[PDB]
Design a protein around this ligand. Structure first.
Ligand SMILES: CNC(=O)c1ccc2cncc(NC(=O)Cc3cccc(Cl)c3)c2c1
Ligand SMILES: CNC(=O)c1ccc2cncc(NC(=O)Cc3cccc(Cl)c3)c2c1
Ligand SMILES: [Cl-]
Lengths: 305, 299
């Protein structure tokens, strides 16, 4: 029993964090095998950030300009290349702590753990979700660039995010581990703003199923809805449209609790109309959208209370 | 910017998790140096000395990864069993066993079959329970904090109470709260809100640009405690006021001025608004957690 925002154990990722220095800029890098991955903006000055020509800035650098520190040891850079917005620094030592890993690009609504780092040293771990507007609501200070997002399914670490910048609203933007940004963002100091954000509907439904599994049914009602009528109501509350894929994905939780997806959709509609009336659901007074259907099955029991 | 419920990096603790089996019971153990610590209920009116005297070293199966450790001794200390093994854990970090007080926070590395599955942050409630997330097999999972490079172990999981909340001991086997390790009618007492932690979280909200709840008013400590007692909030002591000193100096809001904001929040509610993305007053961040997360201390 109980339902917490749970992050994956960070040990496999902590053993990959290094510090990358180029000139006066210091940020974090991910050391996997003999390559250190970091944001390419490490080669920039604050002036260069308005309209950097990364190719022009990189051609002027040599291997010895990049200082890489792993713990108290200085690694030797023997090569460098750029792939999209990530810089790949070839080093002369393979990381003996390299876990089994993959680089995966996630979709909005997916969750992941973040190991926030400063000067190549891990400071904290938290759980978060890729918002529908492609930003993340993280907790990052100056020096956190290069910190990574990941999932650990079995013994394999799937790296899905590398932190690059903070937008004016305090939200964060970054890339996958191949250097492709999530969202319409660029690694430039230019007028960029996060688009209007929406609630991840399929995740709120999964979280309502987690509440039913843990014994809470106060919010259920005798109604059902069509998918179309649910979406017409949902979009008036800035909720993402619920697709037939989402309904299919909620199938296992529907079978376990005995509540049809469109029946749970009707309880969500009523919650949006009435509010909570002083009550809570899993210790929260708001509808939670940062637990996927997969997170709920992983964390919750297989037997409904 | 941003404020998340953040746990300490769990790597130093993951390297200590092992699986302990005795008969049909499997749970988690903490392997430090040549000793494995685990709940004594792994041997299960349980007369634990009578049950332990009947066991031999080879009855305890200890598995570290894919390796079977050899148990060469066993002893009980309060509600924890200490299994002496032949091999010292080469991954043993610098550590201490510390007992925490209600209101203090810690990270939990939830484990099943000696394998870590998740990490979360939580607080020791004033009623000595923890609102954790634990399933069957989680017994022996540990709570900890990190100070520089030293892991301070403060909690070991033992049981779930009927309300879904959890109970456990420090690493010396002393329970937090009036609980016993047996299947008997036990219930968590009435809980209260950790006042000093709510105030620290209000200061974190101000640091992150959320100021709608501030007002021109102040209060006395006595008047605040009379009001706080009415809403099932823990009393605020002069020690708590002193501990909030740094945050008061940084934001320019006196502790008793922030108390007048909290009094107005309790009497009138949030009025449809949120603070740091929450519609409830959050009490699981200490004044130290707020300073650490708004400064970037590393481990
Ligand atoms: C003193 N605080 C900060 O400057 C600060 C706070 C918080 C921050 C959180 N994350 C990243 C930071 N860094 C950047 O956004 C640097 C940057 C600027 C323009 C474009 C690009 Cl790609 C990268 C933060 C920076
Ligand atoms: C049916 N649910 C479970 O089996 C369950 C679910 C969830 C659980 C979460 N944590 C621990 C469990 N374990 C215990 O509380 C076993 C126990 C019983 C009597 C005394 C003592 Cl000291 C320990 C859980 C057990
Ligand atoms: Cl995905």
């Amino acid at each position: 029993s109980g339902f917490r925002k749970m992050a994956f154990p960070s040990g496999k990722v902590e053993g990959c964090m290094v510090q990358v220095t180029c000139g006066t800029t210091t940020l974090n890098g991910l050391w996997l095998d003999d390559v250190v991955y970091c944001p390419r903006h490490v080669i920039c000055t604050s002036e260069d950030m308005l309209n950097p020509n990364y190719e022009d800035l990189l051609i002027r650098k040599s291997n010895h300009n990049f200082l890489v520190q792993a713990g108290n040891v200085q690694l030797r850079v023997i090569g460098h290349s750029m792939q999209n917005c990530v810089l790949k620094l070839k080093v002369d030592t393979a990381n003996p702590k390299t876990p089994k890993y993959k680089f995966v690009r996630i979709q909005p609504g997916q969750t992941f753990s973040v190991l926030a780092c400063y000067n190549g040293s891990p400071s904290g771990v938290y759980q978060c979700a890729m918002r529908p507007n492609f930003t993340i609501k993280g907790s990052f200070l100056n020096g956190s660039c290069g910190s990574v997002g990941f999932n650990i399914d079995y013994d394999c670490v799937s790296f899905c995010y590398m932190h690059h910048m903070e937008l004016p609203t305090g939200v964060h933007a970054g890339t996958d581990l191949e250097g492709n940004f999530y969202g319409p963002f660029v690694d430039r100091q230019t007028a960029q703003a996060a688009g209007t954000d929406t609630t991840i509907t399929v995740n709120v439904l999964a979280w309502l199923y987690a509440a039913v599994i843990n014994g809470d049914r106060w919010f259920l009602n005798r109604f059902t809805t069509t998918l179309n009528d649910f979406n017409l109501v949902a979009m008036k509350y800035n909720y993402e449209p619920l697709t037939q894929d989402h309904v299919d994905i909620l199938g296992p939780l529907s079978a376990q609790t005995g509540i049809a997806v469109l029946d749970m959709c009707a309880s969500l509609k009523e919650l949006l109309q009435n509010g909570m009336n002083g009550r809570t659901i899993l210790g929260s007074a708001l509808l939670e959208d940062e637990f996927t259907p997969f997170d709920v099955v992983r964390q919750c029991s297989g037997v409904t209370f």
